[model samples]
Target: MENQLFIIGIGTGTDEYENFEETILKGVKRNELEGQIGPDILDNCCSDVCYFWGRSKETIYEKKIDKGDMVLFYVGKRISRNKVDLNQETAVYLGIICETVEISENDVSFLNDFWRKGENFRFLMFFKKKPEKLHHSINEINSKLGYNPDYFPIAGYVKPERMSGVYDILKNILK
Candidate 1:
């Protein structure tokens, strides 16, 4: 009940490892956690681990982003390696943050060297439920859902007053 709402912009089309369609949406089973390059575990993947989202060791809104916070995942503008950086800044899914964990600096370095993702994608943010995907644009969701906001941050918490509305909407969406 104390959960807050947030909006996160992900670069779905990035040539980097942020490919939502192939990784997160596709999901990984419990047994493949070690082999999989990404942590796109499905909600029902197993009892030990569930759906989660993460990024590098960059600082974020750590003050408010924690367990119980719900987020609307959007596809933000990202750089491309070739001819594929499609600028699709749209909200694609809803996920609730359950447990947040960080990776060791040593381990982070190892993964970075192995994946070539640089000093990013270090922290892991697990979700309580399976993130649901939708094609609603961030602007569209703001007006239609009566969510008050002027700008869509790369990833930030929503207006405090709109927290309940967010929770209510999530309940409805889940139902």
Candidate 2:
């Protein structure tokens, strides 16, 4: 089957007090989530082999990304720190889906060790990463796509056709 493509937003919401750098990336860097999921999960994400987990988002579950589908993980960060400034930039990472697993709300016994927040349907997609250099800022290709110039959300999927518009740029950097 032909590979599908998607652009997934990684980390936490920008509006929240915990930014991506402080929450998600920090969790992976320090290997301690404190009140969040277990360290083992973050460790795996930092390594070449990692899993991207999506929770409570039907858009994620509905995508049905199969093996060989591409997922681009991205984070939005403030570009200007001025008092009234909200300028931002987005960084994207490339990952190739290797496996997909779904954990139903009822299957919480084993998963409790990873997270004790509540029972909910969560999906995990195991993936392999490319070099850090492969990542690009959304500003770099904002004009190349049909999306608005405003902030993209924490997670979403991009169709292969939409990605084709930026395929050359993606391929060139990923190479």
Candidate 3:
């Protein structure tokens, strides 16, 4: 999926983790999540894996991501849809989407432990590959995107429609 890109914000939104630094940075344990599903898959990765994030939009578009789609994981601070400024934002990680799981009543139970207030938060966990952790300035990418980046996808799309157009630059900007 070189021609497409899916942007995700790992920063806090509605999916509030108790210990933000440790859990997110290290990622969620695959066995625990698999236990919830009581199922197979995920043998190709390192043991501790599956860095999931949430969407506040309450729509099915969050489920649109498919296998092999390259994703840019936004970190640092996020901004609301109406607000203009994206505070402390940066594209800090990249992952090729291996799996995308929709939020279910089953998942709601497991995920509740990590979040304080998120019954409505829709989640999608990209599978297999552990994200390649890198830091690229959001301000620069904002300049590249030529807009104020409301990183969280609340209503429409905070990500550009044609992300591949700027993705070459996205690669170059990463340090």
Candidate 4:
């Protein structure tokens, strides 16, 4: 069971983590989700994992359609879709739209801790807004996550790990 599971961290929406199409591809394919499903097939499994940076758009699109619980990882502040003055009905449907669970940025303690048995889904923090911004350095994420970071080394990603994409799909739960 453990061999089938994968974990990854998306710095922020700046990358595919924030992009829907990219996220889906990374999650379903790069992560080898297809390989994992293998013979098990489907089990009415559903989940969402979302990370909000700007504001929450409570629109029709935001409405979750998932059939299972979701996990959310939010940072800084969240804006309401209503605030944007789109449409209450439409604004209401912006996230994964399923069983929902919320996790805050403050919750993370270590890099590995990002995704464990108890934690919902998985995500990687690319930056730490508080203390200060690294401008461009993986060391910052390492320090924030409480790891030496040498092992976690940072670099611009043309293609991220498949596991990271997989985690985002599940994370849609939080959106």
Candidate 5:
């Protein structure tokens, strides 16, 4: 199979912080020792090492994202105090898959280096910065494709054959 490009909607802030970018970056820098970080928030994905978690365990199995495939993580903003903007609503961080580790719910050793602490997460993937700068206005993809990226589920997959135009635009933007 050919490598794929995926657009993932990430949460920047929760109820605690309004600017999740700053908060997450600080937490990551401090290794979240104060317990203010969460999974899928890029606990670690820097030089030499990377780690990522899906919105849910079921997403990993459903997307089947391989090592060669790429993922663009868009930090979704909360539309309101009570709700978050869904996937495809925003774009920010872009990541390339370097490696992946499948952790079972029974294991907790990985938590030593990451922020997520629980049995609900079972998959972790390694990532590396592709552009070094965050991408913007990725929500244009939804308009280009004439469908919301969240429509297909699994954080939204841009199928090469079906969404080739959308794929091309994303590639061009990153280039």
Candidate 6:
């Protein structure tokens, strides 16, 4: 079955999940925790261990996600303006995926190495964009990576183009 994926990007704010407005992806599930974006695990993938600049949207909603279900997330914003620099790649890639794919808010997870002390390729994946585009990008990536139509990466960064490839990688870690 074809699943849906959702990607989200929050502005520059970290501990205010209780005050931000709600969107389609915000309270689509139970508990309404989805509207909150809290502090990162602080592992290796994101060794910097800094919130940087993101909307003050905290609170997370617990949605049911299946193996092949749709996923959604809010990546926040870009850290810089260049591709070569990986500093903000994860965040931007998240935005791109959210702006380009169609996963559900329940099918995705955020894998972070910020405090884990791991190497690169570790961070948070959030949803902050539309649903139509988010689903489209997922299909394109599944084809480009030559995936067996059964394998999906778990999580990563936001590239802002053709859906975030980093997200594919990040998703792998969680899976």
Best by TM-score: 1
Of candidate 3, the 10-residue stretch with the lowest lDDT total is 14-23
In candidate 6 the C-alpha lDDT for residue 130 amounts to: 25
Candidate 2 clash pair list:
none
Estimate the lDDT of model 6.
0.28
Candidate closest to the true structure, highest lDDT? 1
Tens-digit lDDT track of model 3 for 1-175:
2334655544453344233333345667776567653344355433456555555443335545555556665555545553324554345566655554567744576666555554555555444545676545645544555645453432223354556457666556432
lDDT for each residue of candidate 1 in 110-160, tens digit (9 for 90 to 100) = 434333363466666666556887666655666655743233456565665
Model 6 CA lDDT for position 103: 24
Task: Report the C-alpha lDDT of model 5 over 1-104, residue by residue, as the tens digit.
Answer: 26677755555555222322322333234344224224433444444223344333434335787765667555556464323465425555555665555655
**Tens digit per residue, CA lDDT, model 6, 58-157:** 2113322222333433333223321112223222222222221222344223211121211121222323332222332333444543432222222222
Superior by lDDT: candidate 5 or candidate 6: 5
User: What is candidate 5's local distance difference test score?
Assistant: 0.48
TM-scores vs. true structure, each candidate: 0.67, 0.59, 0.64, 0.20, 0.59, 0.21
**Where does candidate 1 clash, by residue pair?**
55-121, 56-120, 56-121, 56-122
> Positional deviation of 7 in candidate 1, in angstroms?
1.1
Q: State which candidate, 4 or 5, has the greater lDDT.
A: 5
RMSD list, candidates in order:
5.9, 6.7, 4.4, 18.8, 6.8, 15.7
- Spell out the clash pairs found in candidate 5: none
How many Å off is the CA of 41 in candidate 5? 20
What is the RMSD of candidate 6? 15.7
Please state the error at residue 24 of candidate 3 in Å: 3.8
